[PDB]
């Protein structure tokens, strides 16, 4: 009697990926499902990805360490570095509280203010600082690191005198993974990656390719001799067969990009396209680029190079043609604002890059996978 990767194991793998961790107290069905196949999941993840699956009494967690960090990966509810700083300081504070210990919001604010490591002090009389603290506490509460004894933190936005009674939950201990050395000896985050891959010298390339495929929306060819892409090219067929066998995804490969598509996305997943209006303009831009191959001839690496002025001209052309159907949010905003918003959206999906030095825009081949248009009857309606 031996275990096999089956519907339950596939479901467990998806649940592991699309959440940070699964809590027994809140996700008993998912926790039970994951645990039953936990042997097979551990085997497969170790052999192919190299991720460490942590199975514990209270939670199950997959330490998703990326190959090359990307903007969309981080905690999205946060919008400024200060939010991350306050989040980390709050964690440091919770290390000082015993399980189920109760502390008031004022104590947490005071400790965060004291520890906050910047040259510029953290001050609660401001609006922005209080808003940052509220976002940090909301993300904390999202992971059930701290429970709320009745009160209201949202009022903290407009009433610094607000008070709340919080409770440190057990999960605070396990939130952050362990680090190789005395972690303080390191000087920059890049040094962490050089460690996490020092443990995976064995078949580093296969784990690299699998992590890039499963994590990132796409995998872009670095140059003509990118080793990851060469690996994918050499083993396209067996990679596709294995991925189809072990998960819902199906592999695609092009001259300048490779990615996994999903046919029936469940509720909890994030996918492109989606409801947000900025995607509509992304699809329209993709179609517009398809329509002038000679003007936007892609270079050998699959990138299309445009300067901010040229991009703004393209966006103006789009506002002229399809703007009638855009969401009212964009219809009312100047060209440069639309350019900024669209470029942020396309950055999240690794569709394009903003060149650090020349401010040149690189539209990656992944954008050309999908194109969108209004129904012809509306477009003729737009003519009326």
């Amino acid at each position: 009697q031996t275990q096999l990767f089956d519907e339950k194991a596939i479901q467990g793998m998806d649940i592991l990926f699309h959440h940070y961790w699964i809590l027994r107290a809140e996700q008993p069905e998912w926790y039970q499902l994951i645990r039953e196949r936990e042997k097979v999941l551990r085997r497969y993840l170790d052999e192919k990805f190299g991720l460490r699956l942590i199975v514990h009494q209270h939670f199950i967690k997959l330490e998703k360490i990326p190959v090359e960090p990307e903007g969309w990966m981080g905690i999205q509810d946060f919008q400024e570095p200060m939010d991350y700083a306050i989040f980390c300081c709050a964690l440091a504070f919770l290390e000082g509280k015993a399980v189920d210990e109760q502390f008031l919001l004022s104590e947490l604010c005071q400790e965060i203010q004291a520890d906050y490591p910047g040259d510029f002090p953290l001050d609660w009389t401001l609006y922005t600082h209080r808003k940052s603290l509220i976002r940090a506490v909301k993300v904390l509460m999202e992971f059930q690191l701290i429970r709320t004894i009745d009160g209201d933190i949202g009022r903290f936005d407009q009433n610094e005198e607000q008070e709340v009674l919080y409770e440190a939950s057990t999960y605070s201990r396990y939130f952050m993974r362990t680090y190789p050395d005395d972690f303080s000896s390191y000087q920059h985050w890049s040094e962490l990656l050089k460690e996490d891959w020092k443990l995976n010298q064995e078949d580093e390339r296969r784990k690299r390719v699998y992590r890039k495929l499963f994590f990132s929306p796409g995998l872009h060819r670095l140059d003509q001799q990118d080793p990851d892409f060469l690996y994918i090219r050499n083993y396209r067929n067996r990679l596709a067969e294995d991925i189809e066998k072990h998960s819902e995804y199906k592999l695609h490969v092009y001259k300048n990009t490779a990615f996994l598509s999903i046919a029936e996305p469940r509720q909890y997943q994030q996918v492109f396209p989606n409801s947000k209006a900025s995607t509509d303009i992304i699809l329209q831009l993709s179609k517009y680029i398809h329509g002038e191959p000679e003007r936007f001839k892609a270079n050998e690496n699959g990138e299309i190079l445009m300067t901010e002025g040229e991009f703004e001209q393209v966006v103006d052309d789009l506002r002229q043609q399809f703007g009638t159907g855009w969401a009212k949010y964009f219809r009312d905003m100047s060209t440069k604002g639309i350019r900024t918003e669209l470029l942020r959206a396309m950055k999240d999906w690794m569709m394009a890059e903003v060149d650090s030095e020349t401010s040149l825009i690189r539209i990656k081949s992944l954008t050309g996978v999908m194109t969108g248009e209004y129904p012809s009857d509306f477009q003729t309606g737009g003519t009326e």
Binding site: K64, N256, S261, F296, V369, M370, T371
Partner: protein, 50 residues
């Protein structure tokens, strides 16, 4: 993690850049009630003649 939604593994050609390949065509719903936008229960056609 994030990924692209597609109904079928349309392509198989390792040698063609996505731009030069045949794209996947989607029907963007215009975001004006001028055409259609629904949150409350929708209507059906009652196609008795068919």
């Amino acid at each position: 993690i994030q990924h692209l939604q597609l109904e079928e593994a349309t392509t198989e050609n390792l040698h063609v850049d996505t731009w030069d390949e045949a794209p996947t065509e989607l029907t963007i719903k215009p975001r004006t009630v001028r055409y259609r936008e629904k949150t409350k229960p929708g209507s059906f056609n009652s196609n008795e003649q068919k």
